[PDB]
Amino acid sequence: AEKEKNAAEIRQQFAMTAGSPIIVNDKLERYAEVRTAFTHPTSFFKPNYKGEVKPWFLSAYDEKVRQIENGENGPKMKAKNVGEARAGRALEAAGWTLDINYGNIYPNRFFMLWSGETMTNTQLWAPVGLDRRPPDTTDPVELTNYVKFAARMAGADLVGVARLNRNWVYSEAVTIPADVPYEQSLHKEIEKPIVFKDVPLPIETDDELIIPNTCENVIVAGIAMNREMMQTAPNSMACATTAFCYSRMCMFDMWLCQFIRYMGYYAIPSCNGVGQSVAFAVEAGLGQASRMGACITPEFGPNVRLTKVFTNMPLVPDKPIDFGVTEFCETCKKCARECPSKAITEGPRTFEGRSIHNQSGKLQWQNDYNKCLGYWPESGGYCGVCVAVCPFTKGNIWIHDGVEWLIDNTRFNITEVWDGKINTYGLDADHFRDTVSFRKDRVK
Amino acid sequence: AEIRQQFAMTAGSPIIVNDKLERYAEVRTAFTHPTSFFKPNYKGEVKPWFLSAYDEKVRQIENGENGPKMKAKNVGEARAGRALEAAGWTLDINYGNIYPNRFFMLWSGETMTNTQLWAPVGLDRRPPDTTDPVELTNYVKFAARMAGADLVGVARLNRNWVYSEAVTIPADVPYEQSLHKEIEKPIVFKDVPLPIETDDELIIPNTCENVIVAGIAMNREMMQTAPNSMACATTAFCYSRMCMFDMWLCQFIRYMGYYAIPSCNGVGQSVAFAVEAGLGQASRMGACITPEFGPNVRLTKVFTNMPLVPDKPIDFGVTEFCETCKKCARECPSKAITEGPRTFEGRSIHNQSGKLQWQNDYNKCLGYWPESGGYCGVCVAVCPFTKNITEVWDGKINTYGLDADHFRDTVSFRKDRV
């Protein structure tokens, strides 16, 4: 008979010995965040469908408006009617409610404050003194259990811990000056170094973002997207599950930072800022890096968002996992064949970046992310076709052969989504048991 | 979904009222009224109730307790429970988000960062492309589930349950002075295009036909520790879930071409709205009891002119079960819950007279909160419909505290949305 799926058993089967899995050489240096395709001047501007060059997201807005007017849910994808096209973009737009400028990247601004002191919740609770009282627990084992429990309350579907590898922290952040209001933020972005110094608490000066040398650990969360909606990529409902999960990421960061602070430690939130989430996720054991560039997890494949919190709280690092992703990506190449911009390489991994958007000096599949971003104005969304077609995004990829777990090699419209299955936060009760957690799962 | 169809009743508010019913001023609640707001701490110092409760939390942590006369495993465990409680409230203002059109509860989306970022698309300025209440009901309920509701229902807006006057603050008062500068402000209905606040009035349009009610499920293991700290923590986390639900859903409704008023614990009486929208039935303890969660579920609501199909009220025997049960009343640590029958006359200023209900003494309830250092919840914990702290911390958990053993019960297809 079919063995009842056991996600915890799967993770124990593929656990590695300690050690960062990312292979590097001497040319590796920390990466300036301005180099990402979203921010770099070489890629930030894209033509709209009339050929006008604009910031990428404004050209993409022009295409969303055109599609609604034409009763479309995506590029050359007719909707049931104009009302349905409108509803998908209303859902997408609303999903972003708790996110600043598509990613919350500015450190120590808006939702991403590096201290809790000014938050309305901290002020309300100040008479209890939780953020001022020294820690009552310093045992990393108990702290790992407490913080992971808090993380699940805070909306993480996956959580892991790693020692902080500074190679993946941006050398300089993209941010705005402290006196600039929101309405001018996109006009006034600047660079600001992220440095490590012998200081007691995370602190920002006029010149630097200063992370203390005691900032030992990073906690990485996986926030699961909805499979039915992502499978509509590159159309509007894939944009909506993306958007809602960015607001879930924000809530997670603030909730968890506040818990850590109220435990007597400091905590730095980040969402899409501060450093490279995929690298942290691999080092924390959530999954393995893939050909498309994303972290593939056993539970969700790549159909999961990442965020992370940095802290001096003593914790037990998790072990990395190797469930064969590298070898499957070597022979699969489905994302590369289906990518509408041919951004994903069909070749082998190298240490040499394809362009300024890649960090050289680490062995990885080198993709052209300017080509990726170029398809977003064309399609009026955030694509996601690579995630949608990845075999690991399918549910029930795992089978048991009587001895051990293995991957099933055989695996290698929008009206119906609106009328079909949904549940709280887009989670799927057919698979939600996979992320149940007991103390045995949280700390060893 | 089969159970809910089996117990659907014919249309009509199931709350029985008489000719004495008047709308209720929010300042009368035990949290805000001057006769109940102040309570002594354990040293005998009279303070605002929540500050006296803070003193008890501090005392408990120092003494290694998770609750009144409940020893923790150690001081570290005691500290962790209160840290989790305090963190849970991150997205909530002054225990409930009650001030309308302040902080997270804005009545227009125009000034929000998300609306400003999306302004070039014009979704909030474009007339609706859908006016069909059937299609709108399916769209908005799908959105409500994305926004974190475990249950969602629609009712026509009964103004009897809208507060006659809200508790709020002046618009330009900063957060740090909010608690000391609370004021009362009328909520009125007028022929105006959009919800609007003047110096004198909170104005809801006469076109505000409907209320969308969400149920936000709490964690059963944690609530079972009532009145101790982990019950407080699931309470707190769900208040922040409520706030995010209201903002997400209001934005979706605005981007569909309609207006939307968030509320959380403000604007009107959630239990009455939830009963009229079919989420559950009112109970002896005073809560809406649902089939899926019993009373172990939080409520929020959004008011809108979006055309919608109202849901049917449900009757699965709660009234007859409460008539003979009395378990919450016997376990209540403050004897706040009556063992008598339902009447139309409130016991004190804190109750709204003129509706048939079990009349409870809610100042007695609030008095227990500084003594126990929490938000109690024993009545919810012991209710048959709802079915140590080290074991909770070491035990089962899942995303947002939801339980995969029961999560299938809230799956939704179009069939059950409209």
Ligand code: SF4
């Ligand atoms: S589609 Fe295939 S090659 Fe691409 S990430 Fe998924 S498994 Fe790897």
Ligand code: SF4
């Ligand atoms: S998001 Fe789309 S364009 Fe970008 S890499 Fe994936 S498939 Fe290609």
Ligand code: SF4
């Ligand atoms: S404990 Fe008994 S009387 Fe009280 S609300 Fe629950 S069922 Fe009704």
Ligand code: SF4
């Ligand atoms: S919360 Fe506690 S004190 Fe209040 S009515 Fe319920 S059992 Fe009684």
